[PDB]
């Protein structure tokens, strides 16, 4: 009724998913009494399976024709533009997010991966870096993923300031730090690059330095990491 | 030969918007505009606005599902009734719903359910982003508290029929006749706002002549004298003056027995301030969530 | 390896202009090593025909405005040399109110020197490094520290009166907002992206509005520091955030009146019915006081790292990171003149007062730029 | 390096190379045919041929990966027993050395991890598909692997007998009896347990073990 009697159900566009699985995913089993809401629920369920990018249902009067467009499978992964982050680390980062050759392309995760990589570039101090993904459609329902990296110039620590040190001096305290405020002209093996993990370890080293002298009450009230408006002058306090 | 029954119009994160839902909201807004088509005369812009409406609804629904908000059928019961003007709801509501869209009874409730879900999540998040300072509710109420010298405050509207600096007797007679006709029409149930828009020469004409809340003693002397015996809903005649004839209307009044020497007022200021902040935060949250989500229009 | 191969995204070339007038430097005096490569707010100040300037090392000089002759000079470094004669790290822009010269320092110190001779009238320890220009009003000195504290110090005694705590995000932009005074209310920006108004009597918040948009998830897109000085006129407060909105708010209510999609950290000028603003991409603009409608836009100086503008002789003057001063016609936005003043560049605000135009270069050379 | 000829030509070339016995070029052709057409009429046959070629090409880790992929993607393929048998063969091959095999070295003392994995795989195949055509060879390999694992435990017990660690010897032989009761290594190890009991002066346990040995003298 309404949707008429379903004599048979035909699927179109199925490439990977077996017809049995698609039938199992639909709520109607040639029930012979299908309404519009039943068709809408069927579409919603089919999309909820996560295997299709587009779903459409047509009626021949007797036949329910389910036209689906399967989400494309990954053909290859290409990294271009990266000058610092190697392709190996990137490729392992891809597999963690499910992007792997031979698997499907989860479009909704694209933004996620992009942001993640940008976050990584920000942890190293390479602000203004961008990582944008391009999906090109290859035949037989495939895609090629190219990650265009456009890294900027790494920001350099302009200053490392400690406020409230009356027993020791800033120079002495930061001499033991991993992060370097300045590098002597003779030393050409170190730089003033920033890293969040190094900053946390640095705070721990300062705490240990103050606790090994018998203070037993040293407390880091706060830590502020600032950045010049041109994004190449990171500051630490 | 094959007939398209339904299709995905837009993809929203893991959910979808179906062309059937788009048509349903199409019909909803068309029925809404049937009462006054000036509300939504646009067609393409209306269609895109409804597209965005469904997109936001899907975003909010998926977010609420993620959090875990749920509503029982018991909460549904009654949450519809005692709303239709004098309707015999939960029995007569269903019978009348059969004649408009109630082909299946559940449809209505399943929609109501959904709407409640979205409301509950929106309210929860938007109000979570709101912060209120007492100093702020105090300042908002301070003006009224200072102005509460009068035991009763009147909401008022005014209309002006102009006269020149040196009017003739004929001009005075015409202005008086027009003012008296306007007063009679208003007392006969005519809309005061429309009359003010059509005839009033005051700057508030395009605003319907609304003057707002006021202390009677602070009004012009003629207004204070005329309104000394006025009550809510009253229409007062014209008042002669060197610049024309004045007409006054009382819309509402308020007062309390508490001695104002402000007194139980900051609650109302809190309500209004919370409403304004809720509107702002909702707009900022409705666009913070549209930007952050994945959307693809396949309407093609 | 790559740090040398790495290349920046953009930088505009030098605009080609013809000078409708000849700009000349009346005098130039060296105040020391200057701020250097440290992003600071330290800029000169003018008062009663005298010019006060300083540098990060600790030197403070009062000079004759007419010819730049030195009147007195002192150093705020350690008196007894307790440790290597440590630099004072002066960062708070030199302010001059009454007979006092207020300077902030990155050692959480605020100095008030004497105008007559330059002796330290008093010195106070604040909650954190004072990166903002001290604001003198109602006998109080307002300091916005790096850790989101707005403190008020007594003008004479120098003791802290009250303190207001402002939220601090995980990552922010160097520099802090200098409050503005209006009818006993101090309006100040914040590194979280909100403009807040507080009282002067005891520091009781009035209202706190959010100006930013922050349409992003990662840290960089969430940067919304309101590091500019809000401008109050006729009961409306104009504020502007980084990546945020140029907004106008009700002074009493803090309610948004109109909004625009421009962002910057430099100051803007509000005069007559126009708002001369420098975008965060170094693009000069002119808008309307009524709304965000644009009158003209000058996009020839993108990524030049311009300083905040100053309205001098009816022309908008802006410095440049390479050491160039550009004049602009307010009516049209066309370049009117261009000059090469210094070689170290400009990073701090120019000063325009009493018919005089002052600017301090990165190396510390104060310049009087006359026509 | 593989031309982009139509799918049929690529499959024919891969089959010809497999028939000729050139494992590397057949592997390259099959990889091209699988990564160009991921889900097609060739998918199952190409995956099986890749497993076979990897096994014959000594690319055992790749064979294991392909076997796992096939099992997880096609849990109910009619030719799934063949994949389990191939997994058993791969694990058994990881438990072999050619240089030591040439010199006639008994490798039962080396790491038994791969032997254990092969035993597990072959037991799975035999129990799941009793009627498969690979069940007899699987059973023979299971017998051999059980003997080898018992010989490993015997080696450990013998070493600890040499060292004088009697509790360790007793525990090892008890584990052998609980795990591999019917192997020859357990019969050989039984006297070691009796000696360990005797050394610790627990004569009752030694007498019990001696009775067990006597009842099973052969």
If you had to describe this structure to a student in words, what would you say it looks like?
This is part of a larger assembly, with chains A (237 residues), B (300 residues), C (371 residues) and D (218 residues). The relative contact order of chain A is 0.11. Chain A folds into 3 domains: 5-70, membrane protein fhac (Ubiquitin-like (UB roll), Roll); 73-150, Roll (Ubiquitin-like (UB roll)); 156-237, membrane protein fhac (Ubiquitin-like (UB roll), Roll), CATH 3.10.20. Chain A is 29% helix and 22% strand. Chain A has 237 residues and is an alpha/beta fold. Chain B is built from 10 helices and 7 strands. Chain B is extended, with a radius of gyration of 27 Å. Chain C is 0% helix and 41% strand. Chain C contains no helices and 32 strands. Chain D has one domain (1-218): Serine Threonine Protein Phosphatase 5, Tetratricopeptide repeat (Alpha Horseshoe). In chain D, 75% of the residues lie in helices and 0% in strands. In chain D, α7 (113-128) runs antiparallel to α8 (135-163). Chains in contact: A-B, A-C, A-D, B-C. Chains A and C meet through α4 and β8 of A and loops of C. β2 (52-59) of chain A pairs antiparallel with β1 (3-12) of chain B. Chain D: This is Outer membrane protein assembly factor BamD. Chain D: Belongs to the BamD family. Chain D: InterPro entries: BamD (IPR017689), BamD-like (IPR039565), TPR-like_helical_dom_sf (IPR011990). Chain D: Keywords: Cell outer membrane, Lipoprotein, Membrane, Palmitate, Signal. Chain D: Its main location: membrane.
